[PDB]
Amino acid sequence: GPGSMVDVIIYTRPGCPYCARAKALLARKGAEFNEIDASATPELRAEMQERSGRNTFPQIFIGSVHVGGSDDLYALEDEGKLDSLLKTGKLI
């Protein structure tokens, strides 16, 4: 039982899409996040290819729930749905 909470993931290359926005919040809450090297496999490239555009902010992944990325990740932090998000990751 290393962590009663869940594991968060983020779709972004190792430095250059500039995912400082997604980390900006995670840093303020000392939350955990896992980077994903894209442009390497058709499984990820195809996925990010859909949420890609103007090399906008990266995408966030919480458990079995999808997230638009920084836009939603930040939106929830404001409304007050980040706690239960980084703990479970619900869409409600």
Tell me which residues touch Ag ion (CB under 5 A).
16
Q: Pick from Ag ion, a second copy, none: which does 3 bind, CB < 5 to 8 A by kind?
A: none
For the chain, state the CA radius of gyration.
Answer: 13
**Residue 23 sits in the site that holds a second copy (CB under 8 A):** no
**Residue 35 sits in the site that holds a second copy (CB under 8 A):** no
**Residue 39 sits in the site that holds a second copy (CB under 8 A):** yes
- The CA distance from 47 to 27, in Å, is 26
Give the one residue of 5, 7, 18, 66 binding a second copy; rule: CB under 8 A: 18
Buried b (16+ CB within 10 A) or exposed e, 48-87: beeeeeeeebbbbbbeeeebebbebbbebbeeeebeebbe
**Residue 13 sits in the site that holds a second copy (CB under 8 A):** yes
Q: Pick from Ag ion, a second copy, none: which does 56 bind, CB < 5 to 8 A by kind?
A: a second copy
